[PDB]
């Protein structure tokens, strides 16, 4: 499976940084989708102890 | 196509996810974009069959 | 009297000839037609000069770049002229859009894309135009942003690729998580087509639409929702007590400017 690991030009722009080299995603489809979407306004709520598992 | 024409259960495991991170260097939003894309393509195709 | 009849004959024959040269200006006649628009005092009738330029860039989807080359010639030299034209095309673009005039919006947006590629229009106003076009993209405004980007996807991406990546993210999400049809689907596909094609079908400016040098230009920034004005009543002439003074002055400016 061909490996595609893209050389950077400078150190500057971030580690993850969409470069022109990758082809622009632009995924297209029909009316994309809908889900068994559990709407809020019934209820849900996060006890504010957890966090996105590391943001610090 | 073969699994549809023989009516089995349909499972999908997207694998090799480092190839988005270390290999691809894709920021997370467009990472999600590609993931959603693989999902929508395979789903539309199962809708085809 | 004599001076009055003289100012009236000036306005009449001058404006008629300047509009002739406006519709006549070519690419193998770019510098020639611009120097004829200078051989006539185009700033004496600066309002109707902006008006001839606007009329061309509006009623001609295919001579917007030519009216633009004239605008760049006269704008690196008298920036206020292309500036009035720019405020005008912003008025016409917000006219078409905020009144739901597809054709008016498209005319003025093609004019502004020509200006952005000529580097007489700044990138923040182009960003605001793309953003107010893609805020609630339906068929019309999606095609409006995409049509702007058909020619001006190059300049924004070359001076600030930030705008190109932002446009790609916004277009992709607004058309890939929302309820739009084959129109905006294939429109996003076309946008990605130009992107991946590297703006090879539509570069900044074809041969002869950019010859003014690096910093010898004028990109003045008058934005979209900034309460700008047309200042186009100068399309109707006005009596002149300092006609002789300002005439010697402006003829000396055209002599000093060639």
UniProtKB/Swiss-Prot annotation, chain A:
Domain comment (free text): The MPN (JAB/Mov34) domain mediates interaction with TSSC4 and SNRNP200. Has structural similarity with deubiquitinating enzymes, but lacks the residues that would bind the catalytic metal ion. Contains a region with structural similarity to reverse transcriptase, presenting the classical thumb, fingers and palm architecture, but lacks enzyme activity, since the essential metal-binding residues are not conserved.
Tissue-specificity statement: Widely expressed.
Function: Plays a role in pre-mRNA splicing as core component of precatalytic, catalytic and postcatalytic spliceosomal complexes, both of the predominant U2-type spliceosome and the minor U12-type spliceosome. Functions as a scaffold that mediates the ordered assembly of spliceosomal proteins and snRNAs. Required for the assembly of the U4/U6-U5 tri-snRNP complex, a building block of the spliceosome. Functions as a scaffold that positions spliceosomal U2, U5 and U6 snRNAs at splice sites on pre-mRNA substrates, so that splicing can occur. Interacts with both the 5' and the 3' splice site.
Organism: Homo sapiens
Subunit structure and binding partners: Part of the U5 snRNP complex. Component of the U4/U6-U5 tri-snRNP complex composed of the U4, U6 and U5 snRNAs and at least PRPF3, PRPF4, PRPF6, PRPF8, PRPF31, SNRNP200, TXNL4A, SNRNP40, DDX23, CD2BP2, PPIH, SNU13, EFTUD2, SART1 and USP39. Component of the U5.U4atac/U6atac snRNP complexes in U12-dependent spliceosomes. Within the minor spliceosome, which acts on U12-type introns, interacts with PPIL2 and RBM48. Core component of U2-type precatalytic, catalytic and postcatalytic spliceosomal complexes. Found in a mRNA splicing-dependent exon junction complex (EJC) with SRRM1.
Gene behind the chain: PRPF8
Name assigned to this protein: Pre-mRNA-processing-splicing factor 8
Domain of life: Eukaryota
Swiss-Prot record, chain B:
Residues that bind GTP: 15-18
Cellular localisation: Nucleus
Family: Belongs to the TRAFAC class translation factor GTPase superfamily. Classic translation factor GTPase family. EF-G/EF-2 subfamily.
Disease as annotated in the protein's UniProt record: Mandibulofacial dysostosis with microcephaly: A rare syndrome characterized by progressive microcephaly, midface and malar hypoplasia, micrognathia, microtia, dysplastic ears, preauricular skin tags, significant developmental delay, and speech delay. Many patients have major sequelae, including choanal atresia that results in respiratory difficulties, conductive hearing loss, and cleft palate.
Free-text function comment from the UniProt entry: Required for pre-mRNA splicing as component of the spliceosome, including pre-catalytic, catalytic and post-catalytic spliceosomal complexes. Component of the U5 snRNP and the U4/U6-U5 tri-snRNP complex, a building block of the spliceosome. As a component of the minor spliceosome, involved in the splicing of U12-type introns in pre-mRNAs.
Protein species of origin: Homo sapiens (Human)
Residue window of the full protein shown: 244 to 292 of 972
Protein name as catalogued: 116 kDa U5 small nuclear ribonucleoprotein component
Record's subunit section: Component of the U5 snRNP and the U4/U6-U5 tri-snRNP complex, a building block of the spliceosome. The U4/U6-U5 tri-snRNP complex is composed of the U4, U6 and U5 snRNAs and at least PRPF3, PRPF4, PRPF6, PRPF8, PRPF31, SNRNP200, TXNL4A, SNRNP40, DDX23, CD2BP2, PPIH, SNU13, EFTUD2, SART1 and USP39. Component of the pre-catalytic, catalytic and post-catalytic spliceosome complexes. Component of the minor spliceosome, which splices U12-type introns. Within this complex, interacts with CRIPT. Interacts with ERBB4 and PRPF8. Interacts with PIH1D1.
From Swiss-Prot, chain C:
Residues in MIF4G domain copies: 15-198
Localization terms from the record: Nucleus; Nucleus speckle
Disulfide bonds listed in the record: none
Effect of residue 20 to Y: No effect on EIF4A3 incorporation into EJCs
Family: Belongs to the CWC22 family.
UniProt subunit comment: Component of the pre-catalytic spliceosome B and the catalytic spliceosome C complexes. Component of the minor spliceosome, which splices U12-type introns. Interacts with EIF4A3 and PRPF19 in an RNA-independent manner. Direct interaction with EIF4A3 is mediated by the MIF4G domain. Full interaction with EIF4A3 occurs only when EIF4A3 is not part of the EJC and prevents EIF4A3 binding to RNA.
Function per UniProt: Required for pre-mRNA splicing as component of the spliceosome. As a component of the minor spliceosome, involved in the splicing of U12-type introns in pre-mRNAs. Promotes exon-junction complex (EJC) assembly. Hinders EIF4A3 from non-specifically binding RNA and escorts it to the splicing machinery to promote EJC assembly on mature mRNAs. Through its role in EJC assembly, required for nonsense-mediated mRNA decay.
Protein name: Pre-mRNA-splicing factor CWC22 homolog
Organism: Homo sapiens
Lineage: Eukaryota, Metazoa, Chordata, Craniata, Vertebrata
From-to range in the entire protein, with total length: 149 to 406 of 908
């Amino acid at each position: 499976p061909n490996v595609v690991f893209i050389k950077t030009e400078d150190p500057d722009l971030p580690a993850f940084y969409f470069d022109p080299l990758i082809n622009p995603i632009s995924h297209r489809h029909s009316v994309k989708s809908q889900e068994p979407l559990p709407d809020d306004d019934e209820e849900f709520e996060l006890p504010e102890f957890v966090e996105p598992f590391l943001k610090d | 196509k073969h699994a549809v024409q023989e009516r089995l259960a349909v499972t999908v495991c997207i694998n090799k996810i480092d190839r988005l991170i270390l290999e691809l260097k894709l920021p997370p939003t467009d990472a999600y974009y590609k993931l959603r894309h693989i999902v929508d393509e395979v789903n539309g195709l199962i809708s085809m069959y | 009297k004599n001076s009055l009849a003289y100012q009236r004959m000036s306005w009449e024959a001058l404006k008629k000839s300047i509009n002739g040269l406006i519709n006549k200006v070519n690419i193998s006649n770019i510098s020639i037609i611009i120097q004829e628009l200078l051989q006539e005092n185009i700033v004496r009738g600066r309002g109707l000069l902006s008006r001839s330029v606007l009329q061309a860039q509006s009623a001609s989807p295919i001579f917007t770049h030519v009216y633009a080359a004239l605008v760049a010639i006269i704008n690196s030299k008298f920036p206020q002229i292309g500036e009035l034209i720019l405020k005008r095309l912003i008025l016409n673009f917000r006219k078409g859009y905020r009144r739901n005039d597809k054709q008016l919006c498209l005319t003025a947006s093609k004019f502004v894309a020509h200006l952005i590629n000529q580097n007489v229009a700044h990138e923040v106003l182009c960003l605001e135009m793309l953003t107010l076009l893609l805020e609630r993209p339906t068929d019309d405004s999606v095609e409006v942003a995409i049509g702007f980007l058909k020619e001006c996807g190059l300049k924004l991406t070359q001076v600030s690729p930030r705008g190109i990546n932002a446009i790609f993210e916004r277009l992709r999400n607004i058309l890939h998580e929302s309820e739009i049809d084959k129109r905006v689907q294939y429109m996003i596909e076309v946008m990605f087509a130009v992107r991946k094609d590297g703006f090879k079908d539509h570069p900044i400016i074809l041969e002869g639409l950019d010859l003014v040098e690096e910093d010898d230009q004028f990109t003045h920034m008058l934005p979209l929702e900034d309460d700008y004005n047309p200042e186009d009543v100068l399309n109707v002439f006005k009596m002149d007590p300092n006609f002789m003074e300002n005439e010697e002055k402006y003829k000396a400016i055209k002599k000093e400017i060639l």
